[PDB]
């Protein structure tokens, strides 16, 4: 049963390295080229492409991560490897978990609207907002880090593996800022439905437009959630083959995010689609 297992395992993961891989470098060459060729690129198009290079960089560690696993595997098993991948995985993870946090407060504040004066203040000082929080989060980052390093140092030196704990930890210091981007959303949400509401009695219905695109990320945000709360089940409820299972269900964040994005996007949405007519006019 452990090779069948395996081996699904390991086409699910090729398959989610290839859908990431060509995602995110579709928005990067896509942002890049309408740079090139003047198209002045918008704030969120700046956050878009740095979002897809974390991500390629991301995918790139943890297949890296898993080829040194396959090959040559005697180099996984040393201890120095643990620590020295774990540790930049967690920096880069962590450093696009929160640029995606910062995209999505960019789109709460320009986006809604509300009577609280705060609100309005980090509304209309929106783009320092954001760049103070990726700063401000660097605490979270040295933090992570050095929690990470001891808890192995510690597990180490009780040994002279030990990932039930180290992988509750990332799920834990993952879980905070997508509970913020949830109630983000939510509050977004919420904001769009009361606006429409008091447009649909007032103003007549030949004067919230967004609805049809919130649709999807409610789709990727259920998935998400149910493959995350599925994981600190499988960390202690069964099995011991976490090394795989782990490398997998890391990369399926952003391997299917960005599509969301592609497909959220008019800019990417109508890439996509001109890539597709282009193709099909090419075939003949
Ligand atoms: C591909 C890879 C290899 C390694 C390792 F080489 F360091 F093992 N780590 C990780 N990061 C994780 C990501 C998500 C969940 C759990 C870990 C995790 N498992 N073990 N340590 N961190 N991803
Ligand atoms: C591209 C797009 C469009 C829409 C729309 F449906 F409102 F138009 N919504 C989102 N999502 C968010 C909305 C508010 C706050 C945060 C996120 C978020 N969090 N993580 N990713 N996006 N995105």
């Given at each position: 049963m452990g090779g069948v297992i395996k081996s699904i395992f390991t086409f699910v993961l090729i398959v989610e390295f290839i859908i990431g891989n060509l995602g995110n470098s579709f928005i990067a060459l896509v942002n890049c080229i309408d740079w090139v060729k003047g198209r002045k690129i918008s704030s969120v198009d700046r956050i878009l492409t740095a979002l897809a290079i974390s991500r390629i960089s991301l995918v790139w560690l943890i297949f890296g991560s898993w080829c040194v696993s396959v090959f040559f595997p005697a180099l996984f098993a040393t201890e120095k490897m643990?620590?020295?991948?774990?540790?930049?995985?967690?920096?880069?993870?962590?450093?696009?978990?929160?640029?995606?946090?910062?995209?999505?407060?960019?789109?709460?504040?320009?986006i809604?609207?509300?009577?609280?004066?705060?609100?309005?203040?980090l509304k209309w000082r929106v783009k320092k907002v954001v760049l103070v929080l990726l700063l401000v989060t660097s605490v979270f980052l040295f933090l992570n880090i050095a929690l990470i390093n001891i808890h192995i140092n510690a597990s180490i030196n009780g040994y002279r593996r030990f990932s039930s704990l180290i992988v509750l930890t990332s799920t834990v210091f993952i879980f905070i800022p997508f509970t913020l981007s949830l109630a983000?959303?939510?509050?977004?949400?919420?904001?769009?439905?009361?606006?429409?509401?008091?447009?649909?009695?007032?103003?007549?219905?030949?004067?919230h437009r967004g609805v049809k695109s919130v649709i999807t990320f409610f789709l990727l945000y259920a998935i998400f959630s149910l493959s995350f709360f599925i994981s600190v089940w499988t960390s202690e409820r069964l099995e011991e083959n976490l090394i795989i299972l782990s490398q997998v269900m890391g990369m399926a964040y952003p391997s299917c995010h960005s599509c969301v994005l592609i497909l959220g996007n008019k800019k990417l949405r109508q890439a996509s689609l001109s890539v597709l007519l282009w193709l099909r006019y090419m075939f003949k």
């Open positions: 643990f620590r020295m991948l774990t540790n930049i995985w967690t920096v880069i993870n962590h450093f696009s978990v929160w640029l995606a946090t910062g995209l999505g407060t960019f789109y709460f504040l320009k809604a609207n509300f009577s609280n004066s705060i609100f309005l203040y983000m959303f939510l509050l977004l949400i919420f904001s769009m439905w009361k606006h429409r509401k008091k447009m649909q009695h007032t103003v007549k219905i030949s004067g």
